[PDB]
Design a protein around this ligand. Structure first.
Ligand SMILES: CC(=O)N[C@@H]1[C@@H](O)[C@H](O[C@@H]2O[C@H](CO)[C@H](O)[C@H](O)[C@H]2O)[C@@H](CO)O[C@@H]1O
Ligand SMILES: CC(=O)N[C@@H]1[C@@H](O)[C@H](O[C@@H]2O[C@H](CO)[C@H](O)[C@H](O)[C@H]2O)[C@@H](CO)O[C@@H]1O
Ligand SMILES: CC(=O)N[C@@H]1[C@@H](O)[C@H](O[C@@H]2O[C@H](CO)[C@H](O)[C@H](O)[C@H]2O)[C@@H](CO)O[C@@H]1O
Ligand SMILES: CC(=O)N[C@@H]1[C@@H](O)[C@H](O[C@@H]2O[C@H](CO)[C@H](O)[C@H](O)[C@H]2O)[C@@H](CO)O[C@@H]1O
Ligand code: CA
Ligand code: CA
Ligand code: CA
Ligand code: CA
Ligand code: MN
Ligand code: MN
Ligand code: MN
Ligand code: MN
Lengths: 232, 232, 232, 232
């Protein structure tokens, strides 16, 4: 079995294991702040430096993975708390879209909301152009921010949210369990064929963004990950 | 929302929140030992005392849950390491089958391997009578120990195993992530309609068993659980 | 070469290869519980029955050794989690100090913290009388519980900790590597001359203790050992 | 704390986590064969793809590490069993020396035996030009194959050897424990200042080589590694 596993309880600038793209910043307390509160259309993304081989062309096997992380979003004054965070899986050469407008693209797609990635979003702003639900929500995105499936949710300012994600290679099911701070859990599951949507080697990470009038603190506090590919 | 959540880092024998059935015994270190090493066809089960309402007849809503626990199985001399542990969901009036032969029934079914429950088994012995796979395995059981679906696994004596289970009400998907001792993860998922297989109120718990020649240490070390039923 | 090697994956009460002193008790799962949770100044120790010859008077040779074990400490209610575990090397006639007060003496020293032994401690309580650091720590003790050298550490209740110790005869260096639950490793090393501090034949083992208000579960789960003395 | 940890029980071609350099080959059983038995001056090296940051320029902290691996060397007919294996730590841009003559350079140094690396060698051939001891031996190399310190050892054809290495940041002590096939352990320790000899980011790996007349099977069977840098 081919297994990749890591665990970050705090992050630091200068760690070869992590790739920073955009307005990312590592705070003194170990937290990663994804966007710059003073920039227009700010976009920040952090990825695990090492590419993970999620499926094999030789055997046709797809890996299963278990990951869990925790974030926090907080309101800053005079601005609309937007736009949110997205845990994504993209090709190994992934870069922030060329003329990114930040905002509702969450830093992973273009103006129409298209991109090459699969991910779980925690959207705090309703962009009608992307057919966003009228409330905050968690959604599964497959090559687009016009979510394949969404579930109502509620982002609480200053609250530490915990998430657990399991992807079963067999059923190709991606399930998410979000534990809010009030104790209640929110779940969403969807069948996604990683092998048909992504290349053999990909990179996992987080991305967040804002606009001109929408800005808020997007923090990543911890992240653990484990994937196992059955080699034959 | 109607939420039920508990967390046990250690168990104790005078806890009204726990029901002991069979040869269960609480060791001095807080662990629960499910079977009696010196009893033939030994069977032991532990259940959360309070019935959890998983579905409503009024709204037709089914609850979503997130639970994780860790156990350890260890070999004892001169005996075949058998038969295994099962995390199960059963009617609130659940009792050890009358005249249980222990062994391959895992303490939840009758001689043919039938019963009323839904669970995830960690089977360490191949019972051809229940169509068991030729290796150790994790399986999803629905009213029978002839698993609806199994995945090969490997039970390491004296190793602490961690499991995480997520059941998404919408897709009715039950997914399991088992983190072995060597870091490798094993997963299995299956669509199970709790509302059609179980009553409105059920009890969650664990069960293990042995035979005449098959006996081993079955321990439960910790258990956290959280379920949320949307009431409206 | 004169080599002594053994490996315990589980312990049992009628084993002539093991000496039990004090409140030691072997649980049904194979684990050794060093202290009695109901006794006031409780002290329990377990030693390998056979004396190991660590140095020759003939050829001034000292033995090199590689050992690794794993333990678990857990909080019990209403009591301060104290006092800790110590892996020690002592004269073959070693016995629990006469009139031992348990507590910060860790079962190996007198009231002032003096004794005849060398060992690695995993201290979970700061005894100012022994100049203990203000946090949990691992320390190297040479004839006293006022550690020659300490390193900060963190004891996690119910966590299985693994340790590996290497003593290099040439450099007389004792180095320890503690693998926390967390994945993080802690190390400490110190030059200790076994030949000048201990006699030719010694006994290896573990010891733990508690006080009136300080009590917790001290468990030893496994232990392998190999020593080689060059004879020529 | 910044921790990096991985565990390989078997290797595979096409794993992004591993860099193959030279005549390396992944056998069908999962073992890595470092040298080509049919090539003159054969050299093969395998490295962990991701650079590990061993020390910080910010806080003058150095990381501690614990690693253990197992190898096997086997005689092939008509050839001198040479030249050995070396576990090394080198700059992230490390490549096989231009114009390497294999043989006694072990694939990490030039003709004089100089290079930029720190490692532990398991030398099976006495090269007088590098002041090699007259017998097989384990040695600690610091920027040269003219070992800083060596200890006699004995390579047994077809025997699986296990090694454990601990580097304690504080004392800057590197200690090695080699468990031979017959149960006897061999140890060697040396104070090495990684911060003064190596850059902030390095790569860990293995290297082996042969000559025209000296060739043998050099295999790597498993490898686990964990390093922790105190960030603060
Ligand atoms: C100066 C100003 O008026 N700018 C806003 C833009 O910020 C706005 O874009 C959206 O803003 C919200 C937050 O208010 C979200 O971030 C959303 O994703 C953005 O699309 C655009 C469109 O409303 O219009 C005004 O210019
Ligand atoms: C004395 C002896 O040989 N008895 C065995 C039984 O223990 C055995 O029952 C099975 O035993 C295995 C372990 O070996 C499992 O526990 C299984 O569930 C049991 O059914 C029966 C049937 O094989 O036959 C021999 O008696
Ligand atoms: C009931 C109670 O308060 N008793 C305590 C003692 O337990 C205590 O002894 C020390 O206790 C700590 C744990 O809190 C360590 O075990 C220490 O080694 C013991 O000396 C004594 C002295 O502080 O006094 C109060 O009784
Ligand atoms: C055909 C033959 O005679 N070749 C040898 C060389 O192999 C030899 O090189 C050394 O070989 C030994 C093993 O016998 C080791 O691999 C050593 O490191 C090599 O230097 C050279 C020098 O002895 O000369 C003869 O050609
Ligand atoms: Ca949006
Ligand atoms: Ca079975
Ligand atoms: Ca103390
Ligand atoms: Ca040589
Ligand atoms: Mn959305
Ligand atoms: Mn089965
Ligand atoms: Mn101390
Ligand atoms: Mn050499």
């Amino acid at each position: 079995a081919e297994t990749v596993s890591f665990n970050f309880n705090s992050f630091s600038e200068g760690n070869p294991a992590i790739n920073f793209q955009g307005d990312v910043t590592v705070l003194s307390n170990g937290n990663i702040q994804l966007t710059n509160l003073n920039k227009v259309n700010s976009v920040g993304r952090v990825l695990y430096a090492m590419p993970v081989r999620i499926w094999s062309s030789a055997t046709g096997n797809v890996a299963s993975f278990l990951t869990s992380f925790s974030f926090e979003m907080k309101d800053i004054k005079d601005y609309d708390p937007a736009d949110g965070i997205i845990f994504f899986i993209a090709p190994e050469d992934t870069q922030i879209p060329a003329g990114s407008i930040g905002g509702g693209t969450l830093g992973v797609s273009d103006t129409k909301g298209a991109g090459h990635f699969v991910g779980v979003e925690f959207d705090t702003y309703s962009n009608s152009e992307y057919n966003d639900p009228p409330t905050d929500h968690v959604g599964i995105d497959v090559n687009s921010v016009d979510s394949v499936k969404t579930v109502p949710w509620n982002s609480v300012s200053g609250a530490v949210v915990k998430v657990t994600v399991i992807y079963d290679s067999s059923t190709k099911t991606l399930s998410v369990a979000v534990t809010n701070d009030n104790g209640d859990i929110t779940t969403i599951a969807q069948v996604v064929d990683l092998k048909a949507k992504l290349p053999e080697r990909v990179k996992f990470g987080f991305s967040a963004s804002g606009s001109l009038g929408g800005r808020q603190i997007h923090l990543i506090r911890s992240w653990s990950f484990t994937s196992t590919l059955i080699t034959t």
